[PDB]
């Protein structure tokens, strides 16, 4: 496939969708330590942003080589956040629930 | 600040070696709080380290 090397820790961003339905896969489901992988049949469209308007400052460190750091902030500071639609998420979570109950 | 809860930048200043020579000057920048750790061996909060 065209592999997307995107990095994430708790949710598989930008990944390719599941085959035909939500499928659970694990080395040994009965074990606690084996981190299970859940593959979803439909996506949940997450969006994130940072409302602050940073600007970058050119500090110089020794001969020839620069170093960049955040200067002032031009807007009014707010909280960086992410947004997910609730109706998609709860339904998908219940679907994962039934797929777990297949094995439990 | 008096009220509210938002991210904040902890303005810091440092004595960098300047662009020319081994002369020195003072400079200022902003750093997100996880990048900064209190140093002081004594009970003082005016002096800070990078997490490196």
């Amino acid at each position, epitope marked *: 496939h065209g592999i997307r090397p995107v990095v994430s820790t708790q949710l598989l961003l930008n990944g390719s969708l599941a085959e035909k339905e939500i499928v659970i896969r694990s080395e040994n489901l009965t074990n606690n330590a084996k981190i299970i992988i859940v593959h979803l049949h439909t996506p949940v469209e997450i969006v994130c942003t940072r409302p602050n*308007n940073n600007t970058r400052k050119s500090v110089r460190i020794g001969p020839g080589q620069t170093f960049y750091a955040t200067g002032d902030i031009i807007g*009014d500071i*707010k*909280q960086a956040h992410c947004n997910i639609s609730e109706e998609k998420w709860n339904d998908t979570l219940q679907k994962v629930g039934i797929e777990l109950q297949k094995h439990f | 600040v008096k009220n509210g809860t*938002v991210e904040e930048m902890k303005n810091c200043s440092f004595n960098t070696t300047t662009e020319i020579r081994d002369k020195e000057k003072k400079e200022y920048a902003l750093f997100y709080k996880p990048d900064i750790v209190p140093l002081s061996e004594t009970n003082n909060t005016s002096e800070y380290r990078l997490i490196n």
Partner: antibody
Amino acid sequence: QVQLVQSGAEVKKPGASVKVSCKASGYTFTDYYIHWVRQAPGQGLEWMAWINPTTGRTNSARKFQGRVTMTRDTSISTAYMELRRLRSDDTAVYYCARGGWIGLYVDYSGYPNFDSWGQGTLVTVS
Amino acid sequence: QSALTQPASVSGSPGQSITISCTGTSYDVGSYNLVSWYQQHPGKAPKLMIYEVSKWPSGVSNRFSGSKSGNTASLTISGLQAEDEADYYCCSYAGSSTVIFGGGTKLTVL
């Protein structure tokens, strides 16, 4: 109805300083921005600054940077404007107005949607 | 100072239609969705009728409408009653942390 009340009038000498007040009522006084705008007689409007009630961090046009001080007193729902080095040009009418809503996730600070004014206070530099 | 140039004045009579306009710059009017219009007449503080390009505030004047294209924003009047006599002002978010106003104009009626 929502309304803001203002100082009566001011007279000052050149090189002096003037303080004007802006007290608001009828709405939760901490939930909205306050915009300050200036009106010279028979001439165009000049916008001056904005302030978030919940915090400091005022900002103003470059005409008045390093020369205007801005605060609000949360106890009595009153905003205050300080102009510290007057000129004869500054003779004008000063207004305060309620800005957009103070969102916690979106930057509405610069939005020109302010819809409730004070009476206007006349400042004369002579 | 202000880039929001505006005409000086206009005039009209009952039943006519008049369009005011102000020209800004690619930095402020040609980049943001935050132009607004205000009016004032002597003895009164100014008043809002168009905010965020074309939307209306409480009550006043469904009659008025406006839009913008390029660096130009416009306010349109039709019917043109006597109460419309006022000094109309162009306003827009200027980028950065600043709003900026235009020169203003008088509608000479009726």
